[PDB]
Short mmCIF file of C-alpha atoms and ligand atoms in Angstrom, two decimals:
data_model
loop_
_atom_site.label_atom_id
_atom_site.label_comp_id
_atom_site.label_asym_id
_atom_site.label_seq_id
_atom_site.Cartn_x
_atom_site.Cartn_y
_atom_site.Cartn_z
CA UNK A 6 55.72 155.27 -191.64
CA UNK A 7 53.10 153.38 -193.25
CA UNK A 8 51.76 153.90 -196.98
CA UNK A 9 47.98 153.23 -197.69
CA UNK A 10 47.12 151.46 -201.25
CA UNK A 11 43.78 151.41 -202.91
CA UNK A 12 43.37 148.15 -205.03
CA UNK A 13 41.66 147.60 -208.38
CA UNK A 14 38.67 146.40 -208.83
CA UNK A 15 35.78 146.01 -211.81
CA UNK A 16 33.20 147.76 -209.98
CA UNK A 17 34.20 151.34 -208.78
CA UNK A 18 34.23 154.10 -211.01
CA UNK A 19 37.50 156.01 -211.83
CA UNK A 20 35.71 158.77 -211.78
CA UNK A 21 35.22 157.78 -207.81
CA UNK A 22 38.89 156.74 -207.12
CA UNK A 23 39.49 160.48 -208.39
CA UNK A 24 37.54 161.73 -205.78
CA UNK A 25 39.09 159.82 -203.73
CA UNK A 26 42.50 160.56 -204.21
CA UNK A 27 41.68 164.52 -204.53
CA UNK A 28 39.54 164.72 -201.25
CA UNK A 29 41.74 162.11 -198.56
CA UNK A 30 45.01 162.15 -200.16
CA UNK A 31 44.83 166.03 -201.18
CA UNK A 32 46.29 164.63 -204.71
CA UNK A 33 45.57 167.16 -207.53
CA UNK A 34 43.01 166.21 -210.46
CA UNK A 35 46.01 165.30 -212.86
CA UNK A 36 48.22 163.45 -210.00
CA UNK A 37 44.87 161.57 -208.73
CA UNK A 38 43.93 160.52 -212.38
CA UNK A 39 47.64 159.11 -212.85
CA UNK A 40 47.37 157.05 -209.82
CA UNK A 41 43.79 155.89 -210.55
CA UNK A 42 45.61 154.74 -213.98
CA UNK A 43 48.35 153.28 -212.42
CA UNK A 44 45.40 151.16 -210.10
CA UNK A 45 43.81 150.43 -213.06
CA UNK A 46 46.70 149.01 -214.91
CA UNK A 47 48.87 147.10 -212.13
CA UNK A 48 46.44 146.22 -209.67
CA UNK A 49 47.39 148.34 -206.77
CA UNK A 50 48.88 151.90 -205.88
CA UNK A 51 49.88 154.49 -203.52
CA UNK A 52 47.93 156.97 -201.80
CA UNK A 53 49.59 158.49 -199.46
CA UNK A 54 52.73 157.94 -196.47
CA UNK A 55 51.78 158.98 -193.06
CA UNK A 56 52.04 157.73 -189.36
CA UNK A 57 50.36 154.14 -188.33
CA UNK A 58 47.73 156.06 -186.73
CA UNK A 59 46.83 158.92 -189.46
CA UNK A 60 47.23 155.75 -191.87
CA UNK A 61 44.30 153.78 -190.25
CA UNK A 62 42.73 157.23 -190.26
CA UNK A 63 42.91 157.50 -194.37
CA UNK A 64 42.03 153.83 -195.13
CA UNK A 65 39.13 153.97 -192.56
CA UNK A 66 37.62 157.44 -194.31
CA UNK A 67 38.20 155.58 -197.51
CA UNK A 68 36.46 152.81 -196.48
CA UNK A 69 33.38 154.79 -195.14
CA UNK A 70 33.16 156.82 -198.25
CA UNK A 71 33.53 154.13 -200.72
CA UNK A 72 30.81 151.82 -199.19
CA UNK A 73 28.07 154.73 -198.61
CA UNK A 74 28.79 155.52 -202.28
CA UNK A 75 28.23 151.80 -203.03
CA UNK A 76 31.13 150.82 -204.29
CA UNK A 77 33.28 147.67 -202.84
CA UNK A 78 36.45 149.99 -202.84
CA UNK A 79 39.57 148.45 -201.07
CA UNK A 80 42.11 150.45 -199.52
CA UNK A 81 44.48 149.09 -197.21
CA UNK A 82 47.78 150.04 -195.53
CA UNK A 83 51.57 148.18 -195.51
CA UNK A 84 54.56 149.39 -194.00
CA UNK A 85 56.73 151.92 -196.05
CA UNK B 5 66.81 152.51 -204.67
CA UNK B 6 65.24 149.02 -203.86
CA UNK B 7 61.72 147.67 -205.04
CA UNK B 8 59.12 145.61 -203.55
CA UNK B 9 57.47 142.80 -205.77
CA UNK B 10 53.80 142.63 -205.23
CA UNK B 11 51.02 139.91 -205.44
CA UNK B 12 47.11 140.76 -206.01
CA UNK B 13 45.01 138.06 -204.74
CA UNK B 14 42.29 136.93 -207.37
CA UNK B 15 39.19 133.63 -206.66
CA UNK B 16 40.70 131.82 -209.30
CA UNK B 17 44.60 130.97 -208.84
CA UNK B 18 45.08 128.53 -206.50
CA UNK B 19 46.32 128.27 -203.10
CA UNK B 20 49.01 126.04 -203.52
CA UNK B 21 50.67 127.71 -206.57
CA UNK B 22 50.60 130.80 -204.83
CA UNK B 23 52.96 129.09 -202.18
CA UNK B 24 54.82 127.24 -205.43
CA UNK B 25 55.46 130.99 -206.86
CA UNK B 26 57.01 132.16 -203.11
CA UNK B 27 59.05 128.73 -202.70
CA UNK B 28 60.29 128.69 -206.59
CA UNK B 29 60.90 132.79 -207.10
CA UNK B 30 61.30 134.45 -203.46
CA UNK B 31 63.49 132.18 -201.82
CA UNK B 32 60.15 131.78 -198.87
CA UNK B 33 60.33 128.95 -196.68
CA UNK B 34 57.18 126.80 -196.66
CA UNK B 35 55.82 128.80 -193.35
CA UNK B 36 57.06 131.85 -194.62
CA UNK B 37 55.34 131.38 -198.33
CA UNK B 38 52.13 130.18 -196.65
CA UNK B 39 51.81 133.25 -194.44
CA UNK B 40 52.41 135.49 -197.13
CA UNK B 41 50.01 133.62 -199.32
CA UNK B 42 47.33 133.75 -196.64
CA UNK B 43 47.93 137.29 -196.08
CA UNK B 44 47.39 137.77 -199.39
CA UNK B 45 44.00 136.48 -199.41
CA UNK B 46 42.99 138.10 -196.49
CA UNK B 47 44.32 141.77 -197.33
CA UNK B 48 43.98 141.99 -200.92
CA UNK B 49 48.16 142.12 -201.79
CA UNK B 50 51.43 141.88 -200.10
CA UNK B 51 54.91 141.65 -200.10
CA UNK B 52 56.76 138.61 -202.16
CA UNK B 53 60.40 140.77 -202.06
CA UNK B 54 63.21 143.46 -202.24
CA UNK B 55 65.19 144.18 -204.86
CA UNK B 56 67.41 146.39 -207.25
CA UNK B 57 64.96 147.85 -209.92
CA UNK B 58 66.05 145.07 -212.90
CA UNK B 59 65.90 142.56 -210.62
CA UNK B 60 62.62 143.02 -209.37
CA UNK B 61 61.24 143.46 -212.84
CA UNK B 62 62.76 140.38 -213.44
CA UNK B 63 60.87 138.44 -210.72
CA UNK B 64 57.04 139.73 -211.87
CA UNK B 65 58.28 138.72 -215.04
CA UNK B 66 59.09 135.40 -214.15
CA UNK B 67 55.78 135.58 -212.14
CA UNK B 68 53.60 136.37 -214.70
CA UNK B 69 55.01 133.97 -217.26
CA UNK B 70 54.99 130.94 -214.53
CA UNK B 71 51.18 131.92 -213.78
CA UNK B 72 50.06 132.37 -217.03
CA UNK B 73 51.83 128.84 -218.38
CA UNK B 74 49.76 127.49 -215.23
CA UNK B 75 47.06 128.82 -216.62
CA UNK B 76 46.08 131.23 -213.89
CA UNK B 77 45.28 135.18 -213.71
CA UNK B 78 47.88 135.81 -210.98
CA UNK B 79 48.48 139.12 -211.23
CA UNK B 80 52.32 140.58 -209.81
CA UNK B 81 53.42 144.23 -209.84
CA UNK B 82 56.56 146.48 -208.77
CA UNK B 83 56.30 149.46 -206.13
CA UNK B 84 59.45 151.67 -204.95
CA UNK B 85 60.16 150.28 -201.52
MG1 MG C 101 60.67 152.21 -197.60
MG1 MG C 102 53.34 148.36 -201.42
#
């Protein structure tokens, strides 16, 4: 399995990386606002743990979402 | 429970400390640190290690104090593996 990561960056609103987390990771509002924290603080955390495929899936809706919202968003994807 | 020890890649700490920090805390071999290192650049983070909870602590400690005595923003974190 394969975990996708969202990294911090000055730019993005939390309020965004809420959204985020809430809409493609199905996090609740308090779970999604303790992982934007957790970004915010260290740099890098976890969205999510799924197949390679439905990984790619995540960090490429990410991707599409964050950059039509204008924001330079990075989410990526390592082996769990 | 193990723990992977993380690096951030940042425009300001250099290349070749970045290998220094694999070579001198995570045991790398010089093509092993310099793949990581590139990786790093090109994917945002990666992986420096695995270890026991402490331990791993212990190594983004080490990081951050070697980086920051270097007098660069390095930035190292801890994720369950
Ligand atoms: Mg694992
Ligand atoms: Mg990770």
């Amino acid at each position: 399995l394969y975990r996708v990561l969202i990294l911090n960056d000055d730019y993005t609103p939390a309020e965004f990386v809420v959204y985020v987390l809430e809409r493609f990771f199905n996090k609740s509002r308090e779970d999604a606002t303790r992982i934007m924290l957790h970004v915010h603080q260290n740099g890098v955390g976890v969205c999510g743990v799924y197949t390679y495929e439905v990984a790619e899936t995540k960090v490429a809706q990410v991707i599409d979402s964050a950059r039509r919202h204008q924001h330079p968003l990075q989410c990526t994807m390592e082996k769990d």
